[PDB]
């Protein structure tokens, strides 16, 4: 169990970039650019820095070149600059290694804090960020498929409550979870933005981070990137949905980039931002709790995820999960699935929903 | 093998109802008007007469009370009354038995022919219909998942070209299909008003009804429709979708009414009005073809289909296909599909795309 | 007073293509193709050639060069190759001065007529075009404000009963009109493609063209063009609207382009293919006949118009309207409207709705 | 000026309800309810309590029957309950008028603290109140014009910077207004719960309420109201509308309830949570400042407001602007407004936009 540390804890904002390692940055352009109409905020041959259509700061994702593709850091802004001084204090009170660096660790960002935190994840703080041109009625340059935001980071972790406890003392609040009867939990939402998740934890091998995630306005330019994907031929590229999900109630997409780092593409999540806001939970055999049509959760979903980096840019070893596995519980030989609680009628037994099984 | 008659085609408009024998029509009811939202023109103990937003003809459905689920016709509006004739000079001359009905067959139809058509399927061509008011502006009654128009019938038979010989003899255009290089005709796509198709033909067993389309004017509502299900917990009626379409680019969702009788719903597919429109060929392999997504296609969609009735009210014996099946050939044991013609990457050899295998 | 003919009238598919001389081709380039998105079949220092997003014939658009801005050709692509010679016969039977091409007037166009009509418009007849890649799942090229058809044309005349009489005669089936109690008619639409119009009338001092209109698939694209002009700077090229029709029920806008020429974009009308379609008459004091919303017609709407050409080139003279004028009786000093018919509350009287008046 | 108290601010969360007095509670949920699909949280012969499809407090929207119709009260949820005592301790150290009721002023809501604000508007400050069913997910009740949530109030003041700087020291940051280069303001934009605003002030004759403003999820469901309008033959009671604000970037209608009081519905604004998000500045003379798209604003937004009550019932007396007129500086008949600045072309001088002056 992770200690509720004596120092304060850093006063989060809400998500703010990721940092991935990529093999081919010219392949992870076009994805990221050409595919997906990002914009670019800087730009040599090792770095793509890029930004959402409605973004002030300097950036919302850091393609960096690198020998293996994993997450380098998830950033997280701060309230103030004394935020990221109590970040280190409270970090190093929980023994974790901590990194500080005045003039931050990538362009556009100033001082920050990286740490290695108590679930292997390389997280950042910082407040200081370069203003950039907000694009948000830059309509001259709106895609079909346009990503208007950042909104949230997922992490694969071996041990859900373990994490959550330590996510919640960090001032994150849980939204909504998936439990059974028998007290597994399987994944948590939690945030400090007001909408849904800022991070959420998924139950498996960890740490891995299982995506990055961005908004658009409306349903139709989910649809369109799906469209887009289909008329570049690249359809192979779409892992799941698109959706509505269950848990979060956002329209959704999970597509793959060139080293197999998943992105979702969210829309029309819900206020969360009052502190008595409800808490959801869904029973992990419910077949709306994912993709609130019954759709199947495909396998890869539950079992691929990003390699993570420590501070020394090395992989993380990864753990492995004890609790049941979402995946075997629910589509496998032994899973069960249901439409209706207690309702055999809609119910799936050993197989995925629609009528399919795993691959 | 279906001689060209010699007697001149009926000008064929559009299809404009199908008859629908359910079993519980309290049932159908909740279906078609609670669930999808469809208006009444007209009900008792024993039918339901149901029209789209923006019909001025008496229906676009009837929902029957009978023994046995099945169709029992499907109508297609001729140009003038003499076209009725017409009508039953051709299918006479085909040999065919017709029944005329100076006075119709259903309420709100007047003078109509009736067929066993050689296809084994109940057509109907009137063209006299009591008018109704026609809603299209009445935003008053507009649903989130409103369905504006009927657009199509799909049917199941086991000899495509067979069928589509004879459909092209009576006036319908091919606008797109599906074939291999072996030669083997999978479906074929027709029309009369100017979209895509006002029927069609599916490879398998038959003659069976595949499904009948209503259209929407935009994709949200078809997203709607699935998020209503889900909030109803009937999530399971949902079969196959929301997709993109690759023959017809049209939006898509297919549900499943109490009775089983499959409905699509349909939106945005293209102009094919002009003679010389350029007819489309899909490779079967090709998985983007059926889902342009490459979301894998459900096999209930490949092997069920509803009964249809004879001119006596008895269930059509069903004939099986000797030519390929679609279903075996790119998704079974010894199937296969592609993302990109001769890529192995992106292929699926003996089971469907996204990960999963056949239930 | 325009008599029907013995010749039997050529049957038109559609409209198909609009000639527009423009005086300068590089400010029109960046309207129609950086600006609307409209796609380049063919260009050179003279002529641009453009078709919409799901066009397979060689062009929807031609800008040419010249002098005075004005209409050239207005085209409508008729059945078969004997169509054409139809046509022939057709105006000359009605005295008209015509000329014919085999080889066509503009680019990827054959054998073609054209005529100065009854009404002095340059008409132009031909079925023979050359085919070119269909765009329709082109998603990599999909703008968010994507044009995906040409619908319509809508003429300025000044004696509206006298052309609707000639456009039925020649096949045109009128669907919706304006007039009011005492006989007076200010506009009709009328179609062959089954759709609310391919032409329609506006009453007015001409020939003069109103406008050329293309299609999107959904609303949010016609909101997205709005967007982008503001973002270029340009809203003040934005004439009239957004807005749903009342007549045609089609959400709408109004766009200049450099030479003035007015450009509508249009979306979601209904089906009019059958022939008993019920016709639909407004009264011109209905507030919501124009604007269904009630908001106020711009006064140039009903003021402003393009020249349009002669076979030779000239602009042919404008004739003035002697029956009343629309703007006069709805929004003059002397003018009235009505949300409710009958009801002094929402009634505007001397001005337009929404607390205006003319500039 | 307003002092600023040295008392803290108490933490406000977001605007949370209105109470709004009406004549005939009757006609009013016909509005309300009928018409814009708000859910009842309760009811009696004396009020009605309505709340958003996402809400889950007890409601958003007080209807009161009362002989004067007029804003009763606007309130502001706050984060705990010691909140409530620090509000009382913030407006008695400004010498406010205050009343505290231990068990609330309306149903649903606990201790709650109402104020005769220094600006002369009834505040209201709560944390307790009753939770109800959260409805997000009942798309079995989702209109096609769903009206999600609740967002921002607006107020019309005569004193823009000294409202300003009052709110400001209450906690709230100004996130956009309009000024011009003489040192005028004419409105400010102000947020606590990081949209684009909660409250906002809009230069007149004050106290008066300008509007409450509703959220929809996307552009069509704003769409639907006016189409919905435009079929109850009510589009007089749509003011000004639909269009795209320069300021907040929203999509937005504004429309009059049965006794005057302006609702707005919006959506797609941008995230404002950062503690240096960019405040936006626009010039008055803007022309895209106030609709993007260079639409004229209509006469009666700048002139017509609600009533407000002080605590003991009675109408607030009206304290004239001194200050620049918005309406006269831009559509008067001695305004201006530009397109681009410094542009003659496309700028008007003394009229409104496209044509029209006031009526
Ligand atoms: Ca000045
Ligand atoms: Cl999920
Ligand atoms: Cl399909
Ligand atoms: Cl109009
Ligand atoms: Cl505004
Ligand atoms: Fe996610
Ligand atoms: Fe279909
Ligand atoms: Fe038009
Ligand atoms: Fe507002």
Chains 1, 2, 3, 4 share one sequence.
């Not at 070149?65 to 998830?74: N, R, S």
């Not at 660790?105 to 804090?113: N, Q």
């Not at 959420?200 to 409306?218: I, K, W, Y």
Request: proline share 5%.
């Amino acid at each position: 169990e992770i200690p509720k540390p004596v120092a304060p804890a850093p006063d989060i904002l809400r998500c703010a970039y990721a940092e991935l390692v990529v093999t081919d940055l010219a392949k992870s352009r076009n994805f990221y650019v050409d595919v997906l109409g990002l914009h670019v905020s800087y730009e040599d041959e090792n770095q793509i820095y890029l930004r959402s259509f409605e973004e002030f700061i300097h950036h919302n994702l850091v393609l960096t070149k690198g020998p293996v593709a994993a997450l380098k850091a998830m950033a997280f802004r701060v309230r103030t600059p004394e935020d990221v001084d109590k970040a280190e204090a409270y970090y190093q009170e929980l023994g974790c290694r901590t990194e500080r660096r005045k003039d931050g660790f990538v362009k556009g960002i100033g001082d920050a804090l990286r740490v290695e935190d108590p679930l292997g994840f390389p997280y950042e703080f910082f407040f200081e960020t370069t203003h950039v041109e907000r694009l948000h009625m830059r309509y001259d340059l709106y895609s079909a498929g346009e990503l208007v935001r950042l909104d949230h980071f997922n992490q694969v972790t071996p041990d859900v409550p373990r994490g959550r406890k330590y996510l919640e003392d960090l001032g994150f609040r849980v939204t909504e979870d998936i439990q059974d009867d028998e007290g597994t939990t399987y994944a948590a939402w939690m945030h400090r933005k007001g909408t849904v998740h800022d991070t959420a934890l998924t139950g498996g091998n960890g740490p891995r981070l299982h995506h990055v995630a961005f908004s658009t306005h409306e349903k139709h330019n989910i649809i369109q990137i799906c469209d887009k994907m289909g008329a570049l031929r690249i359809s192979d590229r779409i892992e799941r949905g698109p959706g509505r999900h269950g848990v979060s109630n956002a329209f959704y997409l999970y597509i793959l980039d060139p080293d197999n780092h998943r992105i979702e593409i969210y829309t029309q999540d819900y206020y969360t931002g009052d502190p008595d806001n409800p808490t959801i939970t869904w029973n992990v055999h419910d077949n709306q709790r994912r993709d609130w049509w019954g759709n199947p959760v495909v396998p890869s979903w539950y079992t691929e995820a990003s390699k993570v980096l420590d501070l020394d840019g090395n992989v993380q070893e990864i753990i492995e999960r004890t609790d049941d596995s979402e995946l075997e519980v629910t589509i496998g030989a032994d899973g069960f699935s249901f439409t209706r609680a207690g309702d055999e009628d809609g119910s799936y037994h050993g197989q995925a929903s629609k009528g399919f099984k795993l691959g």
